[PDB]
Each structure stands twice: as structure tokens, then as C-alpha cells.
Amino acid sequence: SMSVKKPKRDDSKDLALCSMILTEMETHEDAWPFLLPVNLKLVPGYKKVIKKPMDFSTIREKLSSGQYPNLETFALDVRLVFDNCETFNEDDSDIGRAGHNMRKYFEKKWTDTFK
Numbered sequence: 001s002m003s004v005k006k007p008k009r010d011d012s013k014d015l016a017l018c019s020m021i022l023t024e025m026e027t028h029e030d031a032w033p034f035l036l037p038v039n040l041k042l043v044p045g046y047k048k049v050i051k052k053p054m055d056f057s058t059i060r061e062k063l064s065s066g067q068y069p070n071l072e073t074f075a076l077d078v079r080l081v082f083d084n085c086e087t088f089n090e091d092d093s094d095i096g097r098a099g100h101n102m103r104k105y106f107e108k109k110w111t112d113t114f115k
Helices: 014-027 056-064 071-088 094-114
Strands: none
Touching: 014 056, 014 071, 014 094, 056 071, 071 094
């Protein structure tokens, strides 16, 4: 509360470490469905159904231009990418499986890096 603060967590490396995690996600073989924004002209249903589209290129541009105020807002956009994928794709499809694999990959790096 006012003039009563918890001890300061060192957050000075967070930017660098989220960039590294994002590089590792970008270079995973199963990243291909997630590298670029879904083309809303060419994919029926996507625009109406997926209210907040997100992809790795968009996260990378946000990261590089100071649009994440902290590491939790970064993790929210990454998870959004997988949550969108589960909303639109059957679990037993190539893209559906890619999305489960990538989420697992991400969550491990996240835990090992920060928790």
C-alpha cells in the first residue's frame, strides 16, 4: 500500500529473455501455421469467429517497439495464438497438433526461464 512495498524483482533482462523465447518459437518446425497473420480475405469464418487474431510476427513487432508493458502481457499474446488455434482447428489436424505442440514448448521455456 502507500509507502509499503514488496522487495523489487529484477526485471531488467525480461525484454531480452522474451526475445530469446520468441526466437526459439519462430524457428521450431511446427511454427509454420503461426508465423504470419491469417489472411482474413482468403479464410472463410476467421474474421467473424476469431475476435483477437494474433501471430508470431505481430508479437515480434509489438516486442521490438515497446508495446508490452511487462512479461505477463507478452505471455497473454503468445497464449492467444494457441487459444485461437484451438478455437478454429480440430485437435486431429496438422495445424491443431502444431498448436498443442507449440503451447507445450512455450510453457516449458516460460517456467524454466522465469519460475
